[PDB]
């Protein structure tokens, strides 16, 4: 029996079957209920008649009734799979409380009657998909960013950092700074358009101050985007100012440390004798790590902060948008997976 693999993202769900190289289903993590319930793309098409809610906030499930609607949609409308007839691998955020893990487990075994399940930490899956057992994963998604040191297969819980600055903050910041050129993107629909503009046109400067200088000197910075209505928008220094907020959260009025500082701080929480292996294996994961230029910029910034004896290597896998799901697909395919899961009978008799 083939396992189902479900990565529970704040922004999107990724779902499919063990042994595939990519998820077959990717859909927005949205439930709409009338102003019984609609999920994903269909909810966005009926936004005029529905109140829309995100059941996963910063990687943590916070509306369990609506999350159950998402899982039902996943099994019945996306995969067309009987959940009661497949093992299921489900992902969870770093630092997810054990009580939240228990609640998801209860729902799977007692609502969906899954026969067997395994819960996996997202960042660990990503490290495995990169072909490593030791490293530090920087997983930046839609709702949360984490830095997760992992040694010989296992996360080091005392060293994980959570950063409440991720892709949706960057979409909102681009919405904000586009007012400088007269655009007023504000509605939920317009936000999806600006998200697309961000993904298509943004990049990370190697040196922000120098990029500001060079971009002022000509119009070469300017690039164009075709809106749904056919009008063309032109974006300039917003292209690199938007993801600069990852490094300079003050741009968003946040006092948070930037992603370079956070990674450094996370490594420092680990004992001195394993830090070299973490610095030499900084693995990027998630959609918000997809910006052109990120690896070179992170490498400069982390090299500056770290001891000069350390050998900094930032790894940017091409399919990193999906690395959590892919790692789950690999793990759940192994000859040993059947020994890792919890069965329904075991759970019911605990």
């Amino acid at each position: 029996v083939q396992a189902l693999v479900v990565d529970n993202g704040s922004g999107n769900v990724k779902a499919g079957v063990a042994g595939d190289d990519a998820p077959r289903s990717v859909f927005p993590s949205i439930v709409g209920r009338p102003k019984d319930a609609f999920v994903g793309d269909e909810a966005q098409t009926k936004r005029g008649i529905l109140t829309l809610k995100y059941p996963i906030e910063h990687g943590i499930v916070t509306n369990w009734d609506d999350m159950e609607k998402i899982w039902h949609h996943t099994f019945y409308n996306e995969l067309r799979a009987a959940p009661e007839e497949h093992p299921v691998l489900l992902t969870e955020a770093p630092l997810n409380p054990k009580g939240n893990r228990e609640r998801m487990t209860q729902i799977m075994f007692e609502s969906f009657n899954v026969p067997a399940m395994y819960v996996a930490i997202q960042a660990v899956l990503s490290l495995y998909s990169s072909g490593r057992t030791t490293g530090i994963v920087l997983d930046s998604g839609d709702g949360v960013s984490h830095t997760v040191p992992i040694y010989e297969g296992y996360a080091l819980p005392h060293a994980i950092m959570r950063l409440d600055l991720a892709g949706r903050d960057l979409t909102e910041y681009l919405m904000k700074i586009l007012h400088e050129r007269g655009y007023g993107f504000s509605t939920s629909a317009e936000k999806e358009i600006v998200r697309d503009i961000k993904e298509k046109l943004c990049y990370i400067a190697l040196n922000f101050d120098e990029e500001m200088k060079t971009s002022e000197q000509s119009s070469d910075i300017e690039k164009s985007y075709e809106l749904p209505d056919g009008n063309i928008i032109t974006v300039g220094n917003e292209r690199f100012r938007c993801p600069e907020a990852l490094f300079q959260p003050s741009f968003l009025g946040k006092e948070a440390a930037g992603i370079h500082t956070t990674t450094f701080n996370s490594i420092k929480k680990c004992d001195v004798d394993i830090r070299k292996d973490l610095y030499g294996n900084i693995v990027l994961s998630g959609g918000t790590t997809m910006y052109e230029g990120i690896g070179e910029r992170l490498t400069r910034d982390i090299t500056t902060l770290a001891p000069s004896t350390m050998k900094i290597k930032v790894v940017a896998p091409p399919e990193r948008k999906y690395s959590v799901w892919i790692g789950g697909s690999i793990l759940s395919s192994l000859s040993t997976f059947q020994q890792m899961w919890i069965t329904k009978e075991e759970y019911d008799e605990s």
């Binding site: 072909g131 057992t133 030791t134 297969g153 690999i330 793990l331 395919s333 192994l334 040993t336 890792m340």
Partner: protein
Amino acid sequence: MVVEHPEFLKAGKEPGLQIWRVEKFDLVPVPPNLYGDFFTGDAYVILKTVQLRNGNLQYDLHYWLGNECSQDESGAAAIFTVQLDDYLNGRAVQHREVQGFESSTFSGYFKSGLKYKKGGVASGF
């Protein structure tokens, strides 16, 4: 349950060198006649067991990644490494080995040195 597997049951029982290749999401013994030759298209798990003077056994686990191996193979090699270390009560030291950049310890396991060959077993993906 301690995670096991027939190969797991054979691992680390005697001093020596044991090599497995990842094949279709499984850990398959490499024929001993081939030890030291590695397919560039594949990933491998290597356990070196040493008998110390105290009687005890020392374990070093290496996972070797060919330049052409598929993502399923490198990911499985890493996971199997973790699992075999766990089976050995965590007492193995783990080592990532990339084709052409291997440690001198790993190279030193092979009297004829490390050699590579074109090809490999098909991806599971």
